[model samples]
Target: ASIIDTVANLAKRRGFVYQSGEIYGGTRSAWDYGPLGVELKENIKRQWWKSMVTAREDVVGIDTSIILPREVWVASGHVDVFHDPLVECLNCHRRYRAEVVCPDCGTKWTEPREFNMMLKTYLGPIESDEGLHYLRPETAQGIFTNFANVVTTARKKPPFGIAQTGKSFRNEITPGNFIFRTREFEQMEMEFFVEPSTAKEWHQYWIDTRLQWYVDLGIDRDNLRLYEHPPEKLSHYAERTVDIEYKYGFAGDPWGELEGIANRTDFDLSTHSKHSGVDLSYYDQATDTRYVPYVIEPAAGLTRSLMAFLIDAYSEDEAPNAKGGVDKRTVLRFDPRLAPVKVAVLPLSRHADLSPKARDLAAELRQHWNVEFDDAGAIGRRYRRQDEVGTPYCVTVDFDSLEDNAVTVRERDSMAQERISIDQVTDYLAVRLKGC
Candidate 1:
């Protein structure tokens, strides 16, 4: 669709993203985040962290290693259960997911052969069984393995959580759809351990909370929905599962799941404990008993969230130009809290005095938020560039600014300009950003 194409083109042209290793023709389903992309991704992560961890008393943050001992996977059941249904073409030897047909050969598959999704490699010089290891498939297992460490260090009891944001790997059978699905991706996951009797309530609470977080980020409420997984679609170890879907106007479907929340009833800890011979049960001092705690997990994909935000914020408009010609304009009306460049400083003319003033204003604003300085092109062109990159505001320094310490602040959405004193710019943005 045109919407999908426009989103993809704008991403690469504006330095927000790029294909991975493009000089070598690149690999499939891998992407490199550019300057703007990195800042945008970091901003989204920070907002999520602020709301989920810093704003909550029961949730704590953790950074875990990506690679763990082989025994850890064995205990976590990843070795046995983490697999996909794959089908390889007999004639061409091309592989495809069992549920999907091969577009190249126009062949439909009848049955799927089980295939492991782990990328195995050697740790030492030898390539024997002893050297075999795997990259993590999910960050949740690391939190489970470190449950005792987190609890003991914090001196916390049940009804607490450990949240992590890290890389996860999966040998995807057919990875495509831009950044929606990939072999290597980042996950923002939390494993909340609670009393066995209260696990279901905790799961429902997190489902609502996480959904609300996305809504608060400026995603349209009507374009989002929650879907409970039926029995046939539920994972083997899950007690209950729900997916938060967002409307993405792609080729086939309008709604795609952006995140998942599930009730894992002590499956991870119990399995890991049994396989590693490590007792993962928690001690309840008040009850004088130790038992495995139930887990409520909310797993989100960082890149997918970025793409969803892009789809949700994209807007196209046609406006009359100075010459009376209609010009098509593309703008990313991103939430100020998640915008990469919060403000851009534009000078009406490149005069020596105006340039210096514009640079100084940019420097001052950078101390508070991400700001851009532009004086090369015409003021209108500079504004257009910032609009394409989703800048929230543009402060123009004109001849009048030289006489009085005031600049024209242009709002992105309304294109309305207001003159404000230099001293009040920071406070003005602080208030607007908070409301956004």
Candidate 2:
């Protein structure tokens, strides 16, 4: 299998992802997260939230409903401009982007037709304009509509942002590359409101800031690149867009966009103020002026980020085998902060005393981190298992551990062994897993 397939296989076998409704005829439109997958996904979300919102005084967080009045979509131009030119294979009945050739059949497709990507639904008993609602294709509209609410309630002014992380829906023509592109996906978006004169500066500032986030989280620089949107292709609301792309190696396309930081020059606030008949304009008490703040949006797909992390973390190295020789080890070298399973507690022989001690240590560590307990097989095998799952450290409780209050801890990357008091293990991890 290829590298992409290798990661997908590992994801399926190690409880990272599973086909949604696998027992029945599965659809390609969506996927389900398994036990370990949800933990990793949530960890990614938490880290982004902290980096983008809580760590900065200029930003705050919010969770908005997935659906909003159709007028919001129309005002934002999504109803008109989100339309994709898609062509359908008349024989196989599969749809693809206009330029894409059908994978199932080489037959030519029908003429291009504009299809709106917004997923629409109706509320109330009557399905008309009053009841029509849209599953948001982008989370920025909700943020824009709530600008007055957040400013009034939180006492925030220009140069501040409202960050949100939640699911967004788009009826994409082709959703592939595992979780890279999906109809329903989660996003971490922050719209930084700034004075109109400062929009360009903040736009470049956020472009650099957002790119560094992936690097700080341990994604390889070689696997990432900055793609500036051409003048011809910029989104209608955006004066400029710079995408932070990853080398995902999806079909046909070698790189996929992970995040986009855009210069939306007062488009959202101005439009919302006009449509909603409410003032989203910010009053500048400092300058004795009132004006609509232009927005610089730094939007990232949480699911695509998760996939990139897993791909970057996948590594093959040599490990010591039973015969004193090296054996190939498939390990995920995730940063300690982003690792799904932080530590695993293993008992050497699953002896009565050893098991209890290991479990006690695991239970104690659970209060502080996501810890795992494993005593099912040989010590080496157990360590390999934990390594495959990206557990940063493994603690071993032996008969000797019962005698001395010290246990053996093995580091995943270096394979270095350290013996420390059982009581001090928490402190040791505390010092290492600093931002986790």
Candidate 3:
């Protein structure tokens, strides 16, 4: 728990992320991804794309608009069923989620009323009845509505997936716990259309696949588990659902969901087809069947995943220094593939020759991977900074590099140093990064 707080502090101090619109006092549950945050997020998204689409032959990628027609929400049942039970204090008039007690006055309340979660907005320059639109609450609806377009145009068929990473908005009655739950968030969603009979199998397959992704990315296996949703807790459209929960050590609680996998039976495509007068059916060439295919959705919240990664990677270590005193170290044990800075190029000293060589090496590596050049502080201090930021490897251009044309490569976790030729630095990092 203390380590998690330290990681959050490091993120803010290093410009990783912050509350949005801070100058105007900001808004609750809205956040801005800073430089490091953006880089890390893009890296995560790229890795997910590669693993799901580029690495596999069955999945393809798509990007959709964030705002869509009000009818889309109506077809998706979000306009009617997507709501939270909200209650307001009679004295303070402060709104609160009915499931949770009000933090302001600690007042308990009776059964709450329904409050729609859609963030309604107007289109065009005028606010008329026809101009009403909605900011999307999830990316899955867009994929469902465009199913026919993607299949016919992209030359895909059943058993194929349409993956998307996009922003989504909702009007949450109460949003808290940092980035755990937010009014505005980004989602990495994939809707895998499959035969109705195979929907349950695919649902389980996706659950395993998504859970393994976190483990493959250096998340502690012991700190992760799959939670099956009870029937009462399942979404309206889902026949079954499972949550990939991550243990955050919050109040010594068990864990919380970082991602969700659901078997959303033909609900979405059928609903969209009815509302839009468009056919969202799969043409099975072999079986001569044309019907709406069931979907297995693996939906993940980008902000929640980022927060989980940060908490999972945080570590505190006590080591003996040269003087034999204890040195407490905070480090991020991030996977090399998802790390923001894959490599850091440093010069032993701000020497004329060493600086140029380090800069050149950094430039070369940047072409293939994210690299950072740090020569501001002591070599040890710079290494610590890179470690906290989860840089996998650090290259130091010392006097020996100028003499022998070799730089010292330092591994972050192990602190093992090896001398390699300057030319080999790029390939060395590339090999490890590719393996990751």
Candidate 4:
């Protein structure tokens, strides 16, 4: 199997992700993050918030409604441009985006037509013409709509930013590739408003910053690259754009875009100002001038980032077996900060003495990080279980601990064991799991 398939299987078996609506026949369009998966996702969100918002004095965070005013989309151009070029196969009658060839019967497709990608609904129960509504297809619109509100309250001027992370929906003709293209997914987006003259430099700064973010989170630099969009290929409002592509090793296309950084030349503010008849301009006290702030947006797909992280972390290695021979083992080598389970407590045997000691240790560690306690099988089997789920460390409670007041701690990648006094366990892990 390819790394994608293997990671998908591991994700399911380890309770990282489950097919949505599994009781009824499951659909590939969406998935539900299970216990471990949600933890990993929350950790990813925390890291993003820390780096993009809290750690930066100029950036502030916001949580806007998933469904905004219809006028907001109208001004943002989504009502007119949020579309996919769809085509249908004459042989199998299967429909797909025009960019995709017919995969069902390998037949030529009919002429392509634009299909609206917004999921529509109504604000009122009666569903009249005045009640028309649409679920937001992109999170950027909400940030743009709230630009005035944030600036007024936050007291932020140009060269600052508003960051948001939330769910966005699109009516996709096909949503597959294991969460890569879902009808409903989370987005981590930031609209960095800057002085008109600084748009180009700020766009490049964000591109470089976002690219290094993945590398800092343990993604191999060799597997990541920046792709500059040609001038003709740029979006309607973008002066320039660049995408961060990852080597996902998909069947035919090995690279996929992970994020896009674009320099929007005051288009969003200017459009909203014209449509809403509101002043969306920034007044610079230092320069004694007022102008619509240009935007440099770094838009990232949270679900896609999670999938890439899982694929990059999946590994197969050899571990010593019970018979003193090596056997193949599957492990997820996630960074300590991103690992779903930071530490696992295991008892050498299912004895009353060992069980209580291990349980206590696990309970203590739970206050600091996600901790797992397992006493189901042999010590070696427990280690493998934790390793498979990407638990960075495992603490073994043995009879020796009752006398020496210490336990054996095993590191995942090195498989090295160190005896540490139980009292200093927290301090030991605190140092290693600093950001976690």
Over the stretch 1-436, how does candidate 2's per-residue lDDT look in tens digits?
6788899989999999988888986555688988788989999999999998889999999888898877898889888888888877888988777545568987646888999888888899998878878899888888898999999999998899999999999897776778887889999999999999999998989988988888998899999999999998799999989999998866677798889999998888888878888888889998899998988999999888999999999999888897789988999988888888898999998778787888889999999888888889899999999999898999889999878989998999998999999889999988988755
Pairs clashing within candidate 3: none
Off by over 4 Å in 4: 89-92, 99-102, 105-111, 231-233
TM-score of each: 0.95, 0.96, 0.94, 0.96
Model 3 lDDT on a 0 to 1 scale: 0.84
lDDT agreement with native, every candidate: 0.86, 0.88, 0.84, 0.89
Task: Rank all candidate structures by their lDDT, best first, as comma-separated numbers.
Answer: 4, 2, 1, 3
> What is the per-residue lDDT of model 1 for residues 1-436, given as tens digits with 9 covering 90 to 100?
5776789889989888888999988755899999899989998999888887988889899988888888888877778887888877765678776434567876544457888898787898989999888899889988998898889898878899989999999898876677888899999999999999999889989999998898889899888899999997887668799999988776788778799999999998998788877788999988898889999999998999999998889998975455667677778989999999999999997888898888988998888888888888788878888988899999999999989989999988887889999889878887887623
Clashing pairs in 4: none
lDDT of 4 by residue, 280-383 (tens): 88888897998899999999988899988888888888888889899898888888889988998888989998877788899889888888888898889889
